[PDB]
Tab-separated table of C-alpha atoms and ligand atoms in Angstrom:
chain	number	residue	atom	x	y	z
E	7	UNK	CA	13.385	26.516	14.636
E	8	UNK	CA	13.851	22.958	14.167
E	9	UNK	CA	16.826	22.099	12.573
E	10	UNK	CA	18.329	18.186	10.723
E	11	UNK	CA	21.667	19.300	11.387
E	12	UNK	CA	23.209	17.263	14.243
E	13	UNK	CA	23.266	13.533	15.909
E	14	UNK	CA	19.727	11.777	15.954
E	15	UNK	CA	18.624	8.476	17.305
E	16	UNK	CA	15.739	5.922	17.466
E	17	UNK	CA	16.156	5.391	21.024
E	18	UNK	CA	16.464	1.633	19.788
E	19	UNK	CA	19.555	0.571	17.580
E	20	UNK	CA	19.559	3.742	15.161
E	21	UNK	CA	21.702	6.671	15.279
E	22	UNK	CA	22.024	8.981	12.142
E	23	UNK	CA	24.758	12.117	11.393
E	24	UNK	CA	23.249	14.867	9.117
E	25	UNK	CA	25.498	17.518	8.148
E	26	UNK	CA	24.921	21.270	7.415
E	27	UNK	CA	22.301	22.014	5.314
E	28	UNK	CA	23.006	24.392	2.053
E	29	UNK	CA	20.534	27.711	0.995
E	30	UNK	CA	19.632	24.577	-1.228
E	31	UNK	CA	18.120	22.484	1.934
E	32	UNK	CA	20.272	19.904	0.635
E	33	UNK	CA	22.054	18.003	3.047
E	34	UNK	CA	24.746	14.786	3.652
E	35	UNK	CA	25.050	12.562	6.570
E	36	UNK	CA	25.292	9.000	8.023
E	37	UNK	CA	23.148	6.357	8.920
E	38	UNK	CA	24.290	3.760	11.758
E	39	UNK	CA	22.657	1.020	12.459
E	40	UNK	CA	23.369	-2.493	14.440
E	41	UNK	CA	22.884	-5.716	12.190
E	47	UNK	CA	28.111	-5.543	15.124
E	48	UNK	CA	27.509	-1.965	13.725
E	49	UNK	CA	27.120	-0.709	10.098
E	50	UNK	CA	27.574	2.855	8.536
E	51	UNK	CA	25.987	3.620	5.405
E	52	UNK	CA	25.692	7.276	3.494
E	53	UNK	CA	22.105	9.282	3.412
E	54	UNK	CA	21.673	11.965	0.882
E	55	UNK	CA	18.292	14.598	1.248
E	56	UNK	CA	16.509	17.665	1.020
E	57	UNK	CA	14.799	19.953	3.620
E	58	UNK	CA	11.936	21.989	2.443
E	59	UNK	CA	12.947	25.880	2.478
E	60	UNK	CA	9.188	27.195	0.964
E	61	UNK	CA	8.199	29.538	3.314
E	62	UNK	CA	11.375	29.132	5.706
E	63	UNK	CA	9.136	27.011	8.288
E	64	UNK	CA	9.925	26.664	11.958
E	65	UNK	CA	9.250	23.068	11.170
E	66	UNK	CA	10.074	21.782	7.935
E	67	UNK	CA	9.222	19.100	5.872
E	68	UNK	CA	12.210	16.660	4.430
E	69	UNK	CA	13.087	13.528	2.494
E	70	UNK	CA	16.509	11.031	2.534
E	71	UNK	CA	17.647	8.193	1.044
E	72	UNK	CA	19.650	6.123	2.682
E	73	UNK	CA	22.233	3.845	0.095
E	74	UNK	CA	22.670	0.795	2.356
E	75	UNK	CA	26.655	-0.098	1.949
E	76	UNK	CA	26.036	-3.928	3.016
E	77	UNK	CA	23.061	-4.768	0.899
E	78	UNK	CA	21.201	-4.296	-2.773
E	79	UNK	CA	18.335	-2.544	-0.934
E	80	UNK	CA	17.571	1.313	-0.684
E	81	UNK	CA	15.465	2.933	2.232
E	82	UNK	CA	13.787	6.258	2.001
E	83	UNK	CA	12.127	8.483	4.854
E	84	UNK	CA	9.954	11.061	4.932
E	85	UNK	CA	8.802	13.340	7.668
E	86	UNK	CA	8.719	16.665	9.417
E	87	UNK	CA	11.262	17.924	12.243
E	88	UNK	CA	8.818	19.428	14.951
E	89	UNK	CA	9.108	21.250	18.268
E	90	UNK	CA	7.418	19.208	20.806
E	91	UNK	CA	4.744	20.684	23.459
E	92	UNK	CA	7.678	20.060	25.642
E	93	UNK	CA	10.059	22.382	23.892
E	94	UNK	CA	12.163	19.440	22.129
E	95	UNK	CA	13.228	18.909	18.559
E	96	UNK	CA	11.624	15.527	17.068
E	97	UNK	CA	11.715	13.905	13.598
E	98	UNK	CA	8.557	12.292	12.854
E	99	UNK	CA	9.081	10.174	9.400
E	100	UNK	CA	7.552	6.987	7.983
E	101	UNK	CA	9.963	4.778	5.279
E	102	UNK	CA	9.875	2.626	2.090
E	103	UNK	CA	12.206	-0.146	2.472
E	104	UNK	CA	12.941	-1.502	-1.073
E	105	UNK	CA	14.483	-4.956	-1.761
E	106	UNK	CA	15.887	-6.125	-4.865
E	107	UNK	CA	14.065	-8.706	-6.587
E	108	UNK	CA	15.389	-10.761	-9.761
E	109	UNK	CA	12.123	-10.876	-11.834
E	110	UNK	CA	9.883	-7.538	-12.351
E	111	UNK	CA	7.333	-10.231	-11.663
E	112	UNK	CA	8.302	-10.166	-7.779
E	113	UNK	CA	8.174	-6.513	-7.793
E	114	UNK	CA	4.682	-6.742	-5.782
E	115	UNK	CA	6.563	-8.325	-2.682
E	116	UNK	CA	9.511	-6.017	-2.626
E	117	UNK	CA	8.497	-3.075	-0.643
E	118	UNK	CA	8.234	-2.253	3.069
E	119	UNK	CA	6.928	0.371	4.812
E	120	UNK	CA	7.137	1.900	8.604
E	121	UNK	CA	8.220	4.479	10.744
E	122	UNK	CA	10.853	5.752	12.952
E	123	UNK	CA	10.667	8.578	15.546
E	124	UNK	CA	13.897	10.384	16.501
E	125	UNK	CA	15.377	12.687	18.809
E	126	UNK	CA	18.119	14.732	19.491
E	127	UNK	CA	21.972	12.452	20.494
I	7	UNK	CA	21.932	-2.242	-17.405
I	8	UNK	CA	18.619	-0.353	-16.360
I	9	UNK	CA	20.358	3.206	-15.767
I	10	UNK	CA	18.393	6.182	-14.570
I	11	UNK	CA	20.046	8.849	-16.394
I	12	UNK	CA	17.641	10.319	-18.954
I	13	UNK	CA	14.446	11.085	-19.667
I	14	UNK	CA	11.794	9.665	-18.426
I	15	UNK	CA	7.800	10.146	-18.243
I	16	UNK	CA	4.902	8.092	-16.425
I	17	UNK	CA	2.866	9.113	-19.335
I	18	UNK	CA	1.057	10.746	-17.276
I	19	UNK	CA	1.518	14.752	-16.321
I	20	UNK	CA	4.681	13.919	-15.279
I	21	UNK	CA	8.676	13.558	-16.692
I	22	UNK	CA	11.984	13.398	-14.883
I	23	UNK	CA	15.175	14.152	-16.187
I	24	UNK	CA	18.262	12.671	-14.724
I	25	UNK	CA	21.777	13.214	-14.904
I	26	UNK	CA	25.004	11.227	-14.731
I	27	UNK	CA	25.385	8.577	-11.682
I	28	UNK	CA	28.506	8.898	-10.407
I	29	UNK	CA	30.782	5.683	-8.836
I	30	UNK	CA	29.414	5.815	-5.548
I	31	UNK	CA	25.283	5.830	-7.203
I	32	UNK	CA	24.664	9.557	-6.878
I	33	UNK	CA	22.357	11.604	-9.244
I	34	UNK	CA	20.502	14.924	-9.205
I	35	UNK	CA	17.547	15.538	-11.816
I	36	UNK	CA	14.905	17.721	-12.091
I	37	UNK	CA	11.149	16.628	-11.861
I	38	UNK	CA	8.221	18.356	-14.085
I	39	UNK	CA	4.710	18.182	-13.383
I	40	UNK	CA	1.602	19.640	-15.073
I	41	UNK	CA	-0.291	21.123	-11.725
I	47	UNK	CA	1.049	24.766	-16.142
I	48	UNK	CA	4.051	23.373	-15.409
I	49	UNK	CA	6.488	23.525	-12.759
I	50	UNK	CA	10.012	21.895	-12.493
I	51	UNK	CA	11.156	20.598	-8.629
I	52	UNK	CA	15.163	19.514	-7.839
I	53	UNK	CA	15.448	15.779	-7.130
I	54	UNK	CA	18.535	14.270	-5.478
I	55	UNK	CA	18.856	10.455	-5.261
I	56	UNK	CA	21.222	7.582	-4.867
I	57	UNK	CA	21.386	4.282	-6.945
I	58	UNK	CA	22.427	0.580	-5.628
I	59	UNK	CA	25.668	-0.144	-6.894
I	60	UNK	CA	25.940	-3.072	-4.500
I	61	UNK	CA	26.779	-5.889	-6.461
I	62	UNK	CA	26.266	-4.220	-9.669
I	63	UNK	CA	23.585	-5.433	-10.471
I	64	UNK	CA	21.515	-5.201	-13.751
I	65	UNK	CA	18.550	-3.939	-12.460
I	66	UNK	CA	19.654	-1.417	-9.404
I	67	UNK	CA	17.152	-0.533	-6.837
I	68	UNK	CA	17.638	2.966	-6.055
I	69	UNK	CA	15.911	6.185	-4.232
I	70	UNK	CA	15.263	9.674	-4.406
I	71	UNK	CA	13.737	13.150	-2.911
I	72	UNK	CA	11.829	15.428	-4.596
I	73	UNK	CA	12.227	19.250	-2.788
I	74	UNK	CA	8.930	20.534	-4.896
I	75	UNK	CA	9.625	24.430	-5.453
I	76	UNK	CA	6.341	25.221	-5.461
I	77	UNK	CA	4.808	23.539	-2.289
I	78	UNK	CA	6.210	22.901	1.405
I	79	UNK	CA	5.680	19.323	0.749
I	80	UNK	CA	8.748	17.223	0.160
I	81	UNK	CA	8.053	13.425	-1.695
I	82	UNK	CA	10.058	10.410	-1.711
I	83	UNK	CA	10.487	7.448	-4.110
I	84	UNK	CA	11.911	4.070	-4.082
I	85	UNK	CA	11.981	1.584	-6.723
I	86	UNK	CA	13.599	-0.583	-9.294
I	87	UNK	CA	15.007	0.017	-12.712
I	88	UNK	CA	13.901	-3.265	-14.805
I	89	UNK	CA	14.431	-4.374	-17.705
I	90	UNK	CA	10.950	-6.406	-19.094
I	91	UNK	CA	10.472	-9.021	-21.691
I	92	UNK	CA	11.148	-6.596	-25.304
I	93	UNK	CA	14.302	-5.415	-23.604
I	94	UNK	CA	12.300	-1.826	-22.582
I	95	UNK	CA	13.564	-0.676	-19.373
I	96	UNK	CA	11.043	0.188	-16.543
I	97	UNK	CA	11.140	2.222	-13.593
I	98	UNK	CA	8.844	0.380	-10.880
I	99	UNK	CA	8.567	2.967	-8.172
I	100	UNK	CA	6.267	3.738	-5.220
I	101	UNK	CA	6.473	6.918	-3.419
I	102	UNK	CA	5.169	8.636	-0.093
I	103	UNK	CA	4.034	12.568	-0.023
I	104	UNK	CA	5.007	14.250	3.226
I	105	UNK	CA	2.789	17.708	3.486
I	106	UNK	CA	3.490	19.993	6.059
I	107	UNK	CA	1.291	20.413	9.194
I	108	UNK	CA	1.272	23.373	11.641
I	109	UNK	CA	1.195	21.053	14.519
I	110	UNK	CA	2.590	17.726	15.966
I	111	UNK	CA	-0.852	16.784	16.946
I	112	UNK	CA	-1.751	16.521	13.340
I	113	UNK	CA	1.261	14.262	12.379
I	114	UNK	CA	-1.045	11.835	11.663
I	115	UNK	CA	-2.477	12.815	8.629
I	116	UNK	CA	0.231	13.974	6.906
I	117	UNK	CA	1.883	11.103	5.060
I	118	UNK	CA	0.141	9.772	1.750
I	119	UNK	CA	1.193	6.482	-0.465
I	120	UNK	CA	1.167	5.808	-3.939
I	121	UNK	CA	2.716	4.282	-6.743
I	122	UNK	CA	4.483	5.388	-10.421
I	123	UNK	CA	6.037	3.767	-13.174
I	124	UNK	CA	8.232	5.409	-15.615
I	125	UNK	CA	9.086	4.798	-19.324
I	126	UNK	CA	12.324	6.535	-21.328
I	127	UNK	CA	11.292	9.431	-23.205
X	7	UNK	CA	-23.608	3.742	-9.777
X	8	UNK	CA	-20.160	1.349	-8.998
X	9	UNK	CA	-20.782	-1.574	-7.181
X	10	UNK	CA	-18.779	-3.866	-5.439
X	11	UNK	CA	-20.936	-7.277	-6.243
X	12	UNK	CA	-19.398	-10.135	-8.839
X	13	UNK	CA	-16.386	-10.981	-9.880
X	14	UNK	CA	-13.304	-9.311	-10.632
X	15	UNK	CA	-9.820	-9.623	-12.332
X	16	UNK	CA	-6.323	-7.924	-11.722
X	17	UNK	CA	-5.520	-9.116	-15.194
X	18	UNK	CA	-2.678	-11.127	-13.914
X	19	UNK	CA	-2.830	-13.742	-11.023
X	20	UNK	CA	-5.892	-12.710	-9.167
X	21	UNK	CA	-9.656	-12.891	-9.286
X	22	UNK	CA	-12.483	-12.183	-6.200
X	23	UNK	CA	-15.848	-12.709	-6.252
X	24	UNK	CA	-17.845	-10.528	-3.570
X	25	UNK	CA	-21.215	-10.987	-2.870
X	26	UNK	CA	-24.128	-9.102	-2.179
X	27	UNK	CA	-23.524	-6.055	-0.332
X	28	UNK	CA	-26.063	-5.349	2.553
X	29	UNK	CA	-27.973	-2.128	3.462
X	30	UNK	CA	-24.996	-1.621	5.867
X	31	UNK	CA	-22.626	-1.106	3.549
X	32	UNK	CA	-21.134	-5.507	4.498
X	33	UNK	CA	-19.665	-8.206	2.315
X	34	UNK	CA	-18.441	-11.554	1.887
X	35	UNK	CA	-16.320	-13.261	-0.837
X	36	UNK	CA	-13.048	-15.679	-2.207
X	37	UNK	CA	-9.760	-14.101	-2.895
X	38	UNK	CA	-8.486	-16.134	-5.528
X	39	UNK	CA	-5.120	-16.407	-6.886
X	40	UNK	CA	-2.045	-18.465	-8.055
X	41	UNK	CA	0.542	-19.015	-6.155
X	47	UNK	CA	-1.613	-24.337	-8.581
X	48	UNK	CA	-4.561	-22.249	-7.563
X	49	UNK	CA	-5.227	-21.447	-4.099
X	50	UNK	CA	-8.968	-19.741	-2.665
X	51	UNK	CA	-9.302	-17.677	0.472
X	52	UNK	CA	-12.034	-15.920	2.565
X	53	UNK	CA	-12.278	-12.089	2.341
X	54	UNK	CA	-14.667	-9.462	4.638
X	55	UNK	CA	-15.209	-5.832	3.767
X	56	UNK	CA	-17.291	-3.066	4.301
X	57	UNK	CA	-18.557	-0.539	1.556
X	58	UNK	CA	-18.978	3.385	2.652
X	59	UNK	CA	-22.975	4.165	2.898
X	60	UNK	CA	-22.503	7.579	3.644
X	61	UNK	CA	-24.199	10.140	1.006
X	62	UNK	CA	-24.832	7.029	-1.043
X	63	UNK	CA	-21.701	8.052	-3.315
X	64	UNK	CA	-22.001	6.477	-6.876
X	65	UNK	CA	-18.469	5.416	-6.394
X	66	UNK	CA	-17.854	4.664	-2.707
X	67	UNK	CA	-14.511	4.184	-1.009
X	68	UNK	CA	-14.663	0.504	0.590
X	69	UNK	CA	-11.957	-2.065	2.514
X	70	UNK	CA	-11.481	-5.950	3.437
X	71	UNK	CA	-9.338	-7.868	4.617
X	72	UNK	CA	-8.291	-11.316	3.689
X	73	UNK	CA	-7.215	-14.265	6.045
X	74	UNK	CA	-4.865	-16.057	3.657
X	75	UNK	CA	-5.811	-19.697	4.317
X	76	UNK	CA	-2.271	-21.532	3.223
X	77	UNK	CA	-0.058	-18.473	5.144
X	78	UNK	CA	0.447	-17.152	8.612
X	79	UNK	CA	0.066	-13.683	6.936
X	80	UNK	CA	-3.428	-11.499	6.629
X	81	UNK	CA	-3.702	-8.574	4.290
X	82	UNK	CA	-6.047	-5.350	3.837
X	83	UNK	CA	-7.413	-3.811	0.939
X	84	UNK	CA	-8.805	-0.671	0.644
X	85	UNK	CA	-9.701	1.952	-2.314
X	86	UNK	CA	-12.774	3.607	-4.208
X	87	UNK	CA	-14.963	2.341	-6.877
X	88	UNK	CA	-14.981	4.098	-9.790
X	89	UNK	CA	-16.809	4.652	-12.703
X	90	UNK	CA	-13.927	5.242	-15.350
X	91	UNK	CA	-14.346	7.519	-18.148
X	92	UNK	CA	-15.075	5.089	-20.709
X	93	UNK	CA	-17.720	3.966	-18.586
X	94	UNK	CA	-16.569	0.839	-17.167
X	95	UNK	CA	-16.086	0.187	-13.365
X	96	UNK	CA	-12.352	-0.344	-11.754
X	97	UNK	CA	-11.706	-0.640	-8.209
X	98	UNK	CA	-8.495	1.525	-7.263
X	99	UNK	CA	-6.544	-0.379	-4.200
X	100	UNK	CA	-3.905	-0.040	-2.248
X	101	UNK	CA	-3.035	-2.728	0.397
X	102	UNK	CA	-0.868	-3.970	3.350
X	103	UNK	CA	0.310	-7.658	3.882
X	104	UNK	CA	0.986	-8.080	7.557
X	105	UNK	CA	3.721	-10.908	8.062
X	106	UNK	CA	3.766	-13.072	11.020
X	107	UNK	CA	7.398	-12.358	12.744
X	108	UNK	CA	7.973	-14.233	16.332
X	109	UNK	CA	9.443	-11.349	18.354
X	110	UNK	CA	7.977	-7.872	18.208
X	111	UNK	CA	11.253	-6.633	17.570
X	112	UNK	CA	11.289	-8.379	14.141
X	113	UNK	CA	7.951	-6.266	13.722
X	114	UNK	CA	9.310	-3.171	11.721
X	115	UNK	CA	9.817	-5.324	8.588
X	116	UNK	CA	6.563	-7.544	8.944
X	117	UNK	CA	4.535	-5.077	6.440
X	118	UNK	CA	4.651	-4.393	2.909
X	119	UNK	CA	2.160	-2.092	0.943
X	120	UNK	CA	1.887	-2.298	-2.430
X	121	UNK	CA	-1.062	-1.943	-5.361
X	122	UNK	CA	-3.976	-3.290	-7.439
X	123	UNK	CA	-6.478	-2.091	-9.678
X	124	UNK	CA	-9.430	-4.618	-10.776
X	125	UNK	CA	-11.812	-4.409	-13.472
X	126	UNK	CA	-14.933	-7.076	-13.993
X	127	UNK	CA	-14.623	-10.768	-14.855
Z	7	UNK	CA	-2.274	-16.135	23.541
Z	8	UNK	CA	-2.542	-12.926	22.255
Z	9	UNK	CA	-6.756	-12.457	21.784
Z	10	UNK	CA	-8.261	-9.812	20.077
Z	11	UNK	CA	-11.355	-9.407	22.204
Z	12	UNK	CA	-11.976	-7.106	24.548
Z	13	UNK	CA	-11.152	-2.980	24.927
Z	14	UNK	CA	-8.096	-1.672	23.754
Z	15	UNK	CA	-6.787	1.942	23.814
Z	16	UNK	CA	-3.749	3.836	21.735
Z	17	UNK	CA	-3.848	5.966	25.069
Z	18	UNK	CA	-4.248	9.107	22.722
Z	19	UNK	CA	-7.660	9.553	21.720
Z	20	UNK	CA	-9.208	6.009	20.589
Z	21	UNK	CA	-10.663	3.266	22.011
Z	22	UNK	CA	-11.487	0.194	20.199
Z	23	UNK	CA	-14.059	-2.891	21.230
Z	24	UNK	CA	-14.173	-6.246	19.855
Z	25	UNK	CA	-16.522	-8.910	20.526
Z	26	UNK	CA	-15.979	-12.443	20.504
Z	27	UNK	CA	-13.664	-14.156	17.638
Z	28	UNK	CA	-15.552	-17.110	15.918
Z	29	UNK	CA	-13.601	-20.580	15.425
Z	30	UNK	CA	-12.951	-19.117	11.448
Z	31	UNK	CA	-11.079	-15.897	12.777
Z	32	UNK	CA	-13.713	-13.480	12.497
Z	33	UNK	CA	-14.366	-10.790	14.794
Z	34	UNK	CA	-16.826	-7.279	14.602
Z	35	UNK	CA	-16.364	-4.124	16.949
Z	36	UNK	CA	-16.732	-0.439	17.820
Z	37	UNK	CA	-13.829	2.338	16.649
Z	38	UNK	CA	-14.675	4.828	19.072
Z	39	UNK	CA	-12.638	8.038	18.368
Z	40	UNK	CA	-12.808	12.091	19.418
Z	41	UNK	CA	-13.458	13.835	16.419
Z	47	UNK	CA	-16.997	15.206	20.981
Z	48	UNK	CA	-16.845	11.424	20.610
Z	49	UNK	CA	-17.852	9.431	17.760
Z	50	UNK	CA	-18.689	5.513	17.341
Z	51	UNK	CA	-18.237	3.495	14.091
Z	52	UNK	CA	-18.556	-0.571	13.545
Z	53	UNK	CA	-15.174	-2.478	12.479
Z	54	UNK	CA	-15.270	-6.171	10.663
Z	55	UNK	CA	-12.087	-8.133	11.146
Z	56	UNK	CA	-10.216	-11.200	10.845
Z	57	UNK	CA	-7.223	-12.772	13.155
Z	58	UNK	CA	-4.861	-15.507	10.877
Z	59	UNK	CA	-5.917	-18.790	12.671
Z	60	UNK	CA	-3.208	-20.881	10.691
Z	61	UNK	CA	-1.124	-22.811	13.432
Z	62	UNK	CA	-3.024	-21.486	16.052
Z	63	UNK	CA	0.221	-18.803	16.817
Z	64	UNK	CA	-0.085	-17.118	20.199
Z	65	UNK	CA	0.788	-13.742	18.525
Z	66	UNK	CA	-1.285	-14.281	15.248
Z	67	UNK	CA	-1.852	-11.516	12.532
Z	68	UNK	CA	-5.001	-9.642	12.107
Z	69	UNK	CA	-6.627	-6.632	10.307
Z	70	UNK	CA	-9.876	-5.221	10.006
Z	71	UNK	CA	-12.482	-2.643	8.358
Z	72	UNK	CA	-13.474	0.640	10.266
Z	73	UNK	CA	-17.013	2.497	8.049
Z	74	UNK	CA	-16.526	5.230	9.503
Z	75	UNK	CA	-20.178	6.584	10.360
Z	76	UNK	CA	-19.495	10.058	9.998
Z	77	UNK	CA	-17.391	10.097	6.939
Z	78	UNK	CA	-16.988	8.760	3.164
Z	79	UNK	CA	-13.481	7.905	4.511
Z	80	UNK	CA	-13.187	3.734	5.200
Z	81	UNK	CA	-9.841	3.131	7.185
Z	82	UNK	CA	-8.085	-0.524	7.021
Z	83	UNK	CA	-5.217	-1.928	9.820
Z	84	UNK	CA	-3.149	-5.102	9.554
Z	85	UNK	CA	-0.686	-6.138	12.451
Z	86	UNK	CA	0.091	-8.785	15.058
Z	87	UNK	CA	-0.740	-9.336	18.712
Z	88	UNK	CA	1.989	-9.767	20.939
Z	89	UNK	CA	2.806	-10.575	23.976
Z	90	UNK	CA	5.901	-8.029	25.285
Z	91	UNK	CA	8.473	-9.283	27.886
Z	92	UNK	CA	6.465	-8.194	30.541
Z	93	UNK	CA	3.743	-10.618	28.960
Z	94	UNK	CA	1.482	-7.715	28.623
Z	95	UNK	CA	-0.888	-8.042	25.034
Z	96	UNK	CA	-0.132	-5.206	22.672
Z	97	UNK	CA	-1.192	-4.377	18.740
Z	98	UNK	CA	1.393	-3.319	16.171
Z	99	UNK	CA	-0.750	-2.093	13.219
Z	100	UNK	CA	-0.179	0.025	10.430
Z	101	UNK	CA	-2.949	1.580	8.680
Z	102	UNK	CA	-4.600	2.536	5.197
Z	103	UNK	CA	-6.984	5.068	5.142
Z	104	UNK	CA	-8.802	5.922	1.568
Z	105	UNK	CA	-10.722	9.133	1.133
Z	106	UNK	CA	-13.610	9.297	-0.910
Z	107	UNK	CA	-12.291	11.887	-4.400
Z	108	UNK	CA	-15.031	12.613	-6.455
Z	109	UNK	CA	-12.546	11.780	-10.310
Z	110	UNK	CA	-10.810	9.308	-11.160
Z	111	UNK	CA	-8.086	11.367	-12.278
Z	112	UNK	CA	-7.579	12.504	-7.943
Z	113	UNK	CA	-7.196	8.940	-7.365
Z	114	UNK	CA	-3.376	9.476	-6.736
Z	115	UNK	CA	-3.914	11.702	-3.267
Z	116	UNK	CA	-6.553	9.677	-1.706
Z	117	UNK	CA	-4.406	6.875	0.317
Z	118	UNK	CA	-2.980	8.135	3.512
Z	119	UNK	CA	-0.672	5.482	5.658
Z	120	UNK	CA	-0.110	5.752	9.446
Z	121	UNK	CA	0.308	3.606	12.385
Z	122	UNK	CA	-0.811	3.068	16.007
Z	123	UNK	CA	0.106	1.506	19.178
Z	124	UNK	CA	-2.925	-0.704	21.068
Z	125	UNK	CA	-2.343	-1.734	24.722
Z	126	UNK	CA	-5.792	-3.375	27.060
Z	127	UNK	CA	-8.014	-0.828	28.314
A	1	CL	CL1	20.627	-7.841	-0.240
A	2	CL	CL1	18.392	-3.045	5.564
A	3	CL	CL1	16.229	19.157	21.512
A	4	CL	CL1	11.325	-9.581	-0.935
A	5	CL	CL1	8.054	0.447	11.693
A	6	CL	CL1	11.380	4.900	16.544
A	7	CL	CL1	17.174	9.183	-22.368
A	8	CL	CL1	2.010	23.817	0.728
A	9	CL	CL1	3.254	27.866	-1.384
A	10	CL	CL1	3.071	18.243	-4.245
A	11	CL	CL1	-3.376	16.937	5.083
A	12	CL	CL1	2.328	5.830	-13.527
A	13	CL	CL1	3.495	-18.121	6.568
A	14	CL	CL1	0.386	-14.159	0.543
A	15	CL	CL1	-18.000	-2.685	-16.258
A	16	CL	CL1	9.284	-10.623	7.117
A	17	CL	CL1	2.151	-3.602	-5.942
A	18	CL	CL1	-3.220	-4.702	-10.878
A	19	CL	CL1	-10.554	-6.463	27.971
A	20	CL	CL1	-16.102	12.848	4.015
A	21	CL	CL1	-20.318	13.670	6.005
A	22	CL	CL1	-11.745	9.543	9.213
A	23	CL	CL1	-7.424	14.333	-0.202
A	24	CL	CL1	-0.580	4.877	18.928
């Protein structure tokens, strides 16, 4: 079973913290990232339909030093090698003044990450 | 202020309620979709960074019905009349048996909500 | 049967014109939009396959007054009041100097286009 | 510089060629992908504003064996070894037969090129 509990990271300048995860699949953690270091809060759900070896999930990270929010998306797999990894891709959505700039105000992308 | 809690519907097949925020931009909601109709948890976080008008702000979608988990990101606006707008777009994580098909398992797309 | 030929309108900054479509599915046309008016090259490709009345297509345009290049790609559809709308989703690729600036160089985003 | 032309690989299981790029930016190739191996043309552009050494790009795959059509926008850059590599992301649009699917045909990805 692969599990979101636990220390994660990028392998590049991202760590993340997620909690326990409730009957729910709800879950808390903590996403750290260099800019000098910043923490910021992630809130999220794993999918429990079924009770998969390798669920699906979603998080939102609410970025403490900026007006932007980031959510990922992705699936926690065993690897042919026998290790847990988080495949997810992202939204990365910047506040604009105008709902005229709303076309140029999302990102997307991708992160892999592996056990810390 | 644009505020999420309420009702809301993309006048499509779909509406969203949404509870209270609380200080630090939390929310749960439920989400309702005609596949019929089936209602899904959402958890989420708003931007209070700066507190701004028009918060950007994300959330998860744990669909009770599917192994699939979605995400959302977007920005609560308020247009020209005054009418506040939800500007969102969203990714749709389905679950795949294997790593090797990681690759198809992420699709994009794009909402906007209206109260009521 | 949709077809890509003529010109179109987003209803809001942006017209194309594409040209004739060849029996391998090519074209050629101007991305036009405001940013003062400015015109730019676009090249796509139109599925052939099964000869679909309402074939998925792409393009991409090579913005002529930016660093930047974006992709287009969706299905042409014959709407239920009869009229033809290309469905789009796209990418704009910015130009960042160090490929570790790349993971916020893209944003997706939306358009759907109806005849001019 | 960072040139398009020539074989690339995403060392899993495709391998892309592209011919000579023309003095506007425009380039055609071969998406060559294990489905058993299958061949499909691509039509491209690289950005040719300020003549950067890593410029932007994107092109068109038709796939020959599919409805599908696939789009990718990135940049070419040179690493610190000084060895060429592709970031691109990727659209690809399946063919839905309504309108009203329209909203699960767009699925986003990414890949890695590196020469040969
Ligand atoms: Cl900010
Ligand atoms: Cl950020
Ligand atoms: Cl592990
Ligand atoms: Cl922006
Ligand atoms: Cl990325
Ligand atoms: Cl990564
Ligand atoms: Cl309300
Ligand atoms: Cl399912
Ligand atoms: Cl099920
Ligand atoms: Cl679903
Ligand atoms: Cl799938
Ligand atoms: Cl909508
Ligand atoms: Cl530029
Ligand atoms: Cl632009
Ligand atoms: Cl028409
Ligand atoms: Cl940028
Ligand atoms: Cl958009
Ligand atoms: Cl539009
Ligand atoms: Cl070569
Ligand atoms: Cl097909
Ligand atoms: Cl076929
Ligand atoms: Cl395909
Ligand atoms: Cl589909
Ligand atoms: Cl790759």
């Amino acid at each position: 079973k692969c599990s979101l509990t636990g220390k994660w990271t990028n392998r590049m300048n991202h760590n993340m913290t997620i909690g326990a995860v409730n009957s729910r699949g709800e879950f808390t953690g903590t996403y750290i990232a260099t800019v000098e270091i910043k923490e910021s809060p992630l809130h999220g759900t794993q999918n429990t339909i079924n009770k998969r070896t390798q669920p699906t999930f979603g998080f939102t990270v609410n970025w403490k030093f900026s007006e932007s929010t980031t959510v990922f998306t992705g699936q926690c797999f065993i690897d042919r090698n026998g290790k847990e990894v988080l495949k997810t891709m992202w939204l990365l959505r910047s506040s604009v003044n105008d709902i005229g700039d709303d076309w140029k105000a999302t990102r997307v992308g991708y992160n892999i990450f592996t056990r810390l």
